[model samples]
Target chain A: RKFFVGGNWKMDGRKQSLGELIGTLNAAKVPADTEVVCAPPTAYIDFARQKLDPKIAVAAQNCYKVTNGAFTGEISPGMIKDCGATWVVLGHSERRHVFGESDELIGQKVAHALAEGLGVIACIGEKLDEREAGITEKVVFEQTKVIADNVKDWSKVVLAYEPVWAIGTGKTATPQQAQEVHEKLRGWLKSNVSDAVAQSTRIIYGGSVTGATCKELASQPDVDGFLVGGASLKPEFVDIIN
Target chain B: PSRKFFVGGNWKMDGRKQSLGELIGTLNAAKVPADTEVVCAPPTAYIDFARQKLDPKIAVAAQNCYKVTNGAFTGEISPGMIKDCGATWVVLGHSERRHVFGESDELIGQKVAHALAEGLGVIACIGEKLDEREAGITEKVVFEQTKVIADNVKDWSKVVLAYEPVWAIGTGKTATPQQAQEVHEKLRGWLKSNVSDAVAQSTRIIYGGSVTGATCKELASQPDVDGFLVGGASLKPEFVDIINA
Candidate 1:
């Protein structure tokens, strides 16, 4: 698996602010071998897709499970693709907790998004209470299995592990902690799916991942890359990309 | 009688750049009654494009917007962003937002407040489900829904109440004028008793649900059926006729 970095801008930024960010991104030097994707708010997917360099792929922060219908305020995978965004971020902690998206719904979204030919950045994480209860592995494993069940083509998927406690809290999981989970996730894939999938799939770490913290985390062999949050909206994101 | 007729076209989860551009062109070329206020709610993704292309007289609106100005709420767009995209209005508590997406009355009220705080017009929607109407609790259901929205509003001038029956939306069934008028009249009476007579008379209560060119005129002629909040037909040419109706 190649080194991949995804920046989820979440529900932040308007056209002008994001345009400035895109300008900074287009001129910056990034490693040729790394895969970079940025998930902007759905409204700006089309704007970002056209403004950012082609090397930096555009992704929608989220999308609906079907092609198109009367699901107001929800963009479909086909609409995301029509906007020229090839990727979608699904099952983020915000989606799971804030929006009450169930594992079944997330799996359905993953299936429909993949079926619509958009690559998915599928996220799984355990909340602080769940982690305190010592069921971190159990929670993430169950979540992962749901997403894994829907994925028919591993090549089009990137699994992101963003612990709910660490995201947006400015607290990060130590390099060792991230590596342990990534390696365990790889093992889970190896045991449940196939050896090829376990070896080839990218299991990325996310949760307060910034340029200052990215290097050590990236050094972990099983930690393929990162799904950055707040820092992704800044100039330092370029450092994480390198 | 002093209330300006209101017509809003909710494109829902439809249209891309080229098709929406052409629709905007059609609307731009068409003439609407001076007394009627026309607003089109495009999918949020196309708000900027639609705003830029549509004639200013034909206003642009977001089908929906988030409760807050902006933050970490993924997959949601805020009212400020909708305003920034040149949209002057937002449709809140639409039947789809209520039934399809599971948005609660509490959430819709919060969105209505925020959207108004951001200085945008709100096409606030409220409706009863098929079973609710069948159970003879149509007034109970719609009034309960509208109460949440009405409580959050300080100025009724900027708000347009859209009554979209859940059973009729996209089901090819429209509430007959008599049925629609009965509900609208009841709603107006509810407002007069609860809010003010001025509000009841001044607020435009538009019907939405399978409204088409063929059925629009009679629906438009109803005393309390101020105008319409069109759905699927908004993307078609006859939306102009409904606007004229």
Candidate 2:
């Protein structure tokens, strides 16, 4: 599998800031072995697609369920693709926690986005308390049942495990813990789903991921890549990619 | 009765910009009424599209925006960016945001204050949930919601209040003309006594929730119903009829 580095810029960056950041990425040397995808805000998705380096692809931070309707303030996957973005990020921690997105809603959003032919980064994870309660496996695995039930093809989906505790808090799951969850998810896929899905899926880790720790996490057999958050805005992100 | 009739088309989460180019062409060719103010609020992705393609006489609005001018609020569009995209107006505190996204009155007040301060015309939404209306606490709920913005609003000229009962929104239920008028009159009377007579007389209080061209005339005939903040019917050519009526 190709090493994919998804830069989940989250809610950061405006037109000029993105223009400058993309300018930096375009000028700097990114790793050829890694496939880089930058998820910018919806307002700048098309702008980034037009201006960013061709080597890098653009993804919408989020998208609505239906193609078009009266759901105000939502960007549809139809327009995201129409405007030239190939990917959409669904069920990010910020959306799940801050916006109170339910599992059913996220599953529906993923299904709609996939049907629209957008490559989906379907994020699933547990809170700090859930992990403390020893329910991390149940919480994360429950999400896969919802998402995998909806997704017809595993190849179009990149499962991003972003623990709510670790995201934006500078706390990270140790490479061991990340591998533990990834291997468990794979085993579940092999059993509940097919061996083909278990073998083909790319399960990435997110949550306070930085260049300093990315390499060690990368070495793990089950950890396919990093869904970087804050480090993605900084130049150090290039090192993680390299 | 003295204020210019205002009708805003809220395209909501609908329409692709390119997909609407032909629609815009038709809208441009139509002989729109010159007496009333017509505004169309497109989704964030298509604000620039509506602004560029729609006739200059037609105003453009953003469906939603953040309270802050610009910053790191992910998945949120900033008010400054909305203005930068050539949008002249913004719809704030929609039921979808207040109910669906869990935005409290306090946050919406801040957003309304910030948007008005940023020099964008604001359609400030105030409404009661089904339970509140069912309980007959509609007046109390509306006032509570309105007071939040009234506390922060420095200018009423830039603020248009939209009264959408949560029950009627997207439910295909239209409030009787008398029901809408009574509410509009109730708010206007309160504004006249509390906020000032000028504020009461000058402000445009519009109705929303499943407004179609067929029903607009009866609603428009009411003395206090100034205009409409249209939801579903805004996408069709009849939206022009609503504006014209």
Q: Report the poorest 10 consecutive residues by lDDT, candidate 2 chain B.
A: B67-76
Please write out the lDDT profile of model 2 over residues A1-242, one tens digit for every residue: 66878987754446677778889889878676777889877767767788887898888888878644346657888888877888888888888888788899899999999998999998999999898899999999998889888898878889888888896454567889999988999998899989988888888888788778888899999988888888888889888777
* Residue B69 accuracy (lDDT) in model 1: 46
Tell me how far the alpha carbon of residue A101 in candidate 1 is from the true structure, in angstroms, after superposition. 2.3
TM-score of chain A of each: 0.96, 0.95
Q: What local distance difference test score does each model get?
A: 0.87, 0.83
DockQ leader? 1
Model 2 alpha-carbon drift over 4 Å, by segment: A28-31, A64-70, A126-139, A168-184, A191-195, B30-35, B66-72, B95-107, B127-144, B165-182, B209-225
Inter-residue clash pairs, candidate 2: A11-B74
Q: What lDDT score is found at residue B3 in candidate 1?
A: 74
